[PDB]
Amino acid sequence: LYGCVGISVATTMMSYIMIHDWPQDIGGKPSFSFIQNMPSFVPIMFEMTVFFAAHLMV
């Protein structure tokens, strides 16, 4: 359950900042939606789910 909390944190953070607050272009990366440019968020989303799953149960 702590891991599930973590993924909601990671995805609501990045989907807010990157595509709903400043949708600027950094490279040719399509920041139109959250499906588009999704892969670049995976390295962070993963780490957050482990982080919360680990520390909140310890």
Binding site: I17, G27, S40, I44, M48, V50, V58
Partner: protein, 457 residues
């Protein structure tokens, strides 16, 4: 019971429960000798001098380093990834060997943890030191501010690295710390001085070992081991993508995410093995660290060495197979060019060192394996160096081609991190319980040169 007669004893000397605790507690319960002080002094001096070099270059400029307008990275990130590679050994020994029910890991786990907490920390210095304006480093974090809530992007692997390293360390710190609770309990119960009494009553929590407490303890360690293996892989992979995701010929690839990991395992165990070899003689714990532990370390190194070898020929095949001249030239530059000696000395070490382990007469030798274990770390330093430098001084547009040579302040900082490593590790060995008691006492009856002999008759 049902144990197979094929297996050899992991505990030597017919030792009981008191024998084990006395042996391990003894170095904690007594004074350090003159030799310890000599070595300590040396490591400390190297560290302090290194700090001076760090302060100097931060306060006067990165231009004091041997960096070029072409080669923006060299020795700074080279040493960063080198230390990161070292700090994956302990998280393999305590998590992966756990998952594969490898009993022999019980005599290593505790010192293996020390190897990561004192090496990830060293790596953590380079992400700051090389920065142009490090006093503004706090801008890396997505914190609400007076710039109209100005944020960070989430597309750069440099940011991914921040999350990877900071959470890797954080998780591993609570993991190994929890494992100390039943061992600090065995030191607070000695209380030879009121000072030490207080110290261990604070270091340990209220750990009165009970049925329920142990039940939960076991379950927590199983969960964390399960989470730890993914971290071992994903953290080093995020580091790997600093080069894999580029457009530079010689860096852009898909092999790095598993390739660098295999190298990390290889170099990590080579490091660990040299400390265990000297440890079992200085601390007199050779009855716990046996030749079977040493041999098994050698076997694992051999295996991962061959994986790396396959990746080397994979890259060369693909380079030939590919019709891209820029990729082929990059490999020609490594084979023949101004840095040929870095490339070929690197290849010599990584190709031949792990192949000596096929010979039992070489594998089962603490003398030979000590030497080889040292050699591996040299080759791996060049592995990181060669990839970064040889791919930057030669690339698109011949007019931009250059060289590279480091300065004494590049060298000095590296020396400083080595000195600091040993200051921390050396102090550790005189204050912490080097072998987990809760772990060893669960295998003393299952294996050892007493009970096996009893089973045989």
């Amino acid at each position: 019971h049902y144990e197979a007669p094929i297996r050899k004893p992991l505990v030597i000397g017919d030792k009981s429960y008191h024998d084990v605790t006395v042996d391990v507690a003894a170095p904690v319960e007594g004074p350090a000798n003159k030799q310890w002080w000599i070595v300590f002094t040396i490591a400390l001096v190297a560290f302090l001098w290194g700090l001076g070099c760090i302060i100097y270059t931060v306060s006067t400029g990165i231009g004091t380093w041997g960096l070029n307008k072409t080669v923006g990275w060299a020795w700074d990130i080279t040493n960063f990834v080198w230390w990161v590679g070292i700090g994956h050994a302990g998280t393999l020994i305590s998590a992966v060997l756990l998952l594969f029910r490898q009993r022999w890991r019980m005599a290593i786990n505790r010192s293996a943890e020390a190897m990561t907490i004192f090496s990830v920390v060293q790596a953590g210095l380079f992400p700051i030191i090389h920065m142009g304006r490090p006093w503004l480093a706090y801008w890396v974090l997505p914190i609400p501010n007076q710039f109209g809530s100005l944020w960070v992007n989430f597309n750069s692997p440099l940011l991914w690295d921040v999350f990877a390293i900071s959470t890797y360390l954080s998780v591993s710190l609570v993991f190994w710390w929890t494992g100390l609770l039943p061992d600090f309990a065995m030191l607070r119960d000695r209380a030879i001085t009121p000072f030490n009494k207080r110290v261990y009553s604070i270091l340990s929590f209220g750990w009165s070992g009970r049925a329920k407490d142990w039940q939960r303890f076991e379950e927590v360690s199983l969960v964390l081991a399960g989470l730890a293996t993914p971290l071992v892989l994903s953290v080093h992979t995020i580091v790997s993508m600093d080069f894999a995701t580029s457009v530079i010929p010689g860096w852009h690839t898909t092999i790095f995410p598993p390739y660098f990991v295999a190298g990390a395992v290889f170099s990590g165990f080579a490091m660990v093995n040299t400390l265990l070899i000297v440890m079992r003689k200085v601390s007199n714990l050779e009855a716990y660290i046996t030749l079977q532990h040493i041999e098994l370390m050698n076997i694992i190194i051999m295996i991962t060495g061959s994986i790396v070898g396959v990746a080397y020929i994979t890259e060369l095949f693909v380079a030939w197979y590919s019709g891209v001249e820029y990729e082929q030239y990059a490999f020609l530059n490594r084979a023949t060019g101004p840095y040929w000696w870095a490339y070929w000395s690197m290849m010599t070490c990584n190709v031949f060192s792990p192949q000596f382990m096929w010979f039992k007469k070489l594998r089962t030798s603490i003398m030979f394996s000590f030497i080889i274990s040292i050699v591996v770390n040299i080759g791996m330093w060049f592995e990181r160096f060669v990839i970064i430098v040889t791919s930057l001084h030669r690339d698109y547009l011949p007019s931009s081609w250059t060289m590279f040579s480091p300065t004494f302040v590049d060298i000095g900082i590296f020396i400083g991190t080595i000195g600091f490593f040993f200051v921390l590790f050396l102090l550790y060995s005189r204050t912490f319980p080097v072998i987990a008691q809760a772990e060893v006492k669960t295998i003393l009856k299952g294996t050892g040169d007493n009970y096996i002999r009893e089973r045989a008759n």
